[PDB]
Design an enzyme around this catalytic site. Sequence first.
Site, PDB file in Angstrom:
ATOM      1  N   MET A  81      50.246  33.825  32.296  1.00  0.00           N
ATOM      2  CA  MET A  81      51.223  34.308  33.326  1.00  0.00           C
ATOM      3  C   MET A  81      50.398  33.844  34.787  1.00  0.00           C
ATOM      4  O   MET A  81      48.977  34.026  34.441  1.00  0.00           O
ATOM      5  CB  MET A  81      51.566  35.340  33.421  1.00  0.00           C
ATOM      6  CG  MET A  81      52.703  35.807  32.268  1.00  0.00           C
ATOM      7  SD  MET A  81      53.463  37.330  32.393  1.00  0.00           S
ATOM      8  CE  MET A  81      54.999  36.763  33.486  1.00  0.00           C
ATOM      9  N   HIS A 113      48.387  38.888  38.961  1.00  0.00           N
ATOM     10  CA  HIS A 113      48.546  39.236  37.290  1.00  0.00           C
ATOM     11  C   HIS A 113      48.241  37.992  36.650  1.00  0.00           C
ATOM     12  O   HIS A 113      49.163  37.123  36.744  1.00  0.00           O
ATOM     13  CB  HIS A 113      49.798  39.976  37.076  1.00  0.00           C
ATOM     14  CG  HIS A 113      50.275  40.071  35.519  1.00  0.00           C
ATOM     15  ND1 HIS A 113      49.367  40.636  34.692  1.00  0.00           N
ATOM     16  CD2 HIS A 113      50.810  39.098  34.868  1.00  0.00           C
ATOM     17  CE1 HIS A 113      49.953  40.492  33.422  1.00  0.00           C
ATOM     18  NE2 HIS A 113      50.970  39.460  33.519  1.00  0.00           N
ATOM     19  N   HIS A 167      44.131  55.969  34.071  1.00  0.00           N
ATOM     20  CA  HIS A 167      43.530  54.535  34.241  1.00  0.00           C
ATOM     21  C   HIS A 167      44.470  54.092  35.524  1.00  0.00           C
ATOM     22  O   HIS A 167      43.828  53.557  36.502  1.00  0.00           O
ATOM     23  CB  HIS A 167      43.308  53.723  33.058  1.00  0.00           C
ATOM     24  CG  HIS A 167      42.902  52.561  33.264  1.00  0.00           C
ATOM     25  ND1 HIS A 167      43.277  51.228  33.605  1.00  0.00           N
ATOM     26  CD2 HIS A 167      41.294  52.310  33.086  1.00  0.00           C
ATOM     27  CE1 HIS A 167      42.437  50.249  33.303  1.00  0.00           C
ATOM     28  NE2 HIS A 167      41.326  50.839  33.061  1.00  0.00           N
ATOM     29  N   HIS A 168      45.716  54.212  35.284  1.00  0.00           N
ATOM     30  CA  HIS A 168      46.734  53.723  36.147  1.00  0.00           C
ATOM     31  C   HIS A 168      47.928  54.028  36.079  1.00  0.00           C
ATOM     32  O   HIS A 168      48.509  54.688  35.070  1.00  0.00           O
ATOM     33  CB  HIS A 168      46.615  52.022  36.509  1.00  0.00           C
ATOM     34  CG  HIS A 168      47.561  51.144  35.496  1.00  0.00           C
ATOM     35  ND1 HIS A 168      46.919  51.128  34.227  1.00  0.00           N
ATOM     36  CD2 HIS A 168      48.628  50.504  35.801  1.00  0.00           C
ATOM     37  CE1 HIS A 168      47.937  50.096  33.543  1.00  0.00           C
ATOM     38  NE2 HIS A 168      48.635  49.873  34.453  1.00  0.00           N
ATOM     39  N   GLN A 180      55.402  54.832  34.829  1.00  0.00           N
ATOM     40  CA  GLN A 180      54.691  54.406  33.521  1.00  0.00           C
ATOM     41  C   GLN A 180      53.194  54.837  33.876  1.00  0.00           C
ATOM     42  O   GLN A 180      52.569  54.639  34.985  1.00  0.00           O
ATOM     43  CB  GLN A 180      54.604  52.884  33.626  1.00  0.00           C
ATOM     44  CG  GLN A 180      53.994  52.414  32.322  1.00  0.00           C
ATOM     45  CD  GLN A 180      53.845  50.880  32.149  1.00  0.00           C
ATOM     46  OE1 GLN A 180      53.202  50.059  32.827  1.00  0.00           O
ATOM     47  NE2 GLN A 180      54.684  50.554  31.241  1.00  0.00           N
ATOM     48  N   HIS A 195      49.278  54.975  32.272  1.00  0.00           N
ATOM     49  CA  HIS A 195      48.439  54.286  31.390  1.00  0.00           C
ATOM     50  C   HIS A 195      47.279  55.040  31.113  1.00  0.00           C
ATOM     51  O   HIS A 195      46.217  55.529  32.021  1.00  0.00           O
ATOM     52  CB  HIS A 195      47.779  53.104  31.855  1.00  0.00           C
ATOM     53  CG  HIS A 195      46.878  52.305  30.831  1.00  0.00           C
ATOM     54  ND1 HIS A 195      45.783  51.745  31.321  1.00  0.00           N
ATOM     55  CD2 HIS A 195      46.896  52.223  29.734  1.00  0.00           C
ATOM     56  CE1 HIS A 195      45.141  51.310  30.375  1.00  0.00           C
ATOM     57  NE2 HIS A 195      45.614  51.656  29.129  1.00  0.00           N
ATOM     58  N   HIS A 249      46.459  36.582  32.354  1.00  0.00           N
ATOM     59  CA  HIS A 249      46.211  37.130  31.240  1.00  0.00           C
ATOM     60  C   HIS A 249      44.613  36.830  31.066  1.00  0.00           C
ATOM     61  O   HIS A 249      44.133  36.514  32.178  1.00  0.00           O
ATOM     62  CB  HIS A 249      47.038  36.727  29.977  1.00  0.00           C
ATOM     63  CG  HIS A 249      48.285  37.114  30.291  1.00  0.00           C
ATOM     64  ND1 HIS A 249      49.537  36.417  29.631  1.00  0.00           N
ATOM     65  CD2 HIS A 249      48.871  38.317  30.703  1.00  0.00           C
ATOM     66  CE1 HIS A 249      50.533  37.239  29.718  1.00  0.00           C
ATOM     67  NE2 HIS A 249      50.275  38.090  30.606  1.00  0.00           N
TER      68      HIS A 249
END
Length: 310
Positions: A270, A198, A63-64, A126, A128, A200
């Site tokens: 955020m 970014h 996904h990323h 990382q 995902h 939420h």
Amino acid sequence: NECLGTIGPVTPLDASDFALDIRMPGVTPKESDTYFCMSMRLPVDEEAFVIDFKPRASMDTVHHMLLFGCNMPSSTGSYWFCDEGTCTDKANILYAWARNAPPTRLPKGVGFRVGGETGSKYFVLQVHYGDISAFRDNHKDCSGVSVHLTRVPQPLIAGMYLMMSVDTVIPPGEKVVNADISCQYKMYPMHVFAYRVHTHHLGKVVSGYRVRNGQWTLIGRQNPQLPEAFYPVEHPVDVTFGDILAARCVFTGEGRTEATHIGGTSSDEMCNLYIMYYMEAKYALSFMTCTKNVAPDMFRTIPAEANIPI
Ligand SMILES: [Cu+2]
Ligand SMILES: [Cu+2]
């Protein structure tokens, strides 16, 4: 890409250059939306420049992917679940890849400064994994990124300008609450070429602008529910001494019972805008931030776009 084997993840290309192949060590996720992390120590102690990133991601399953520079990875294993954290110290974002977003390339002559006395000693990757029906065959995944490093000093140096709300209170119900961020720019020129937003779940739109002589110039505008890669800046913009950097995150108080504040958890909100820039090497800063709203009255002339969803 296929599972590399045992060829070696560090490939010296010449006296000044080396490729890092930063790949998952044959991982097999058991549930959907898994976050796997791994680290790789920079194989030189002196200053080096990251000048290219080539994604090696299975389209089916990834996904990323994020690539970070830091000095203290959150764990030491071959791989680790990292819902929790990527680095114990500051994670400097270098690279973002998302399944459907088209990845910005570094402009010519641009590198991220790593190693030496003050630069990152480690890369942390990382990955995902979303939909994991592609792992029904119990196959092993070796997704990641191929990084080109040089010891040649680059004429342009990449950095990250982080704009971030701290004081924002979103009352329950309140259909529309604005989180406004603004700082005076006082440094030598930066050339803004990519952005990432970014928030939420309560975030409807995020926009950032350079404001000069009262004129608003769009840096980026994005629905913060879409995937969070670096989108290219449509018309890349210089930011110079005396400009104001201004951002607005639009919030709702609907679906919520109590007052929502800023925090690291999803029950908290955020308002972050990451601006990827370059500067001339002799003036370069790898990092800048704005956590203020120094010109709140200036927002009276913010363009209409900043207040309407996309
Ligand atoms: Cu993802
Ligand atoms: Cu967050």
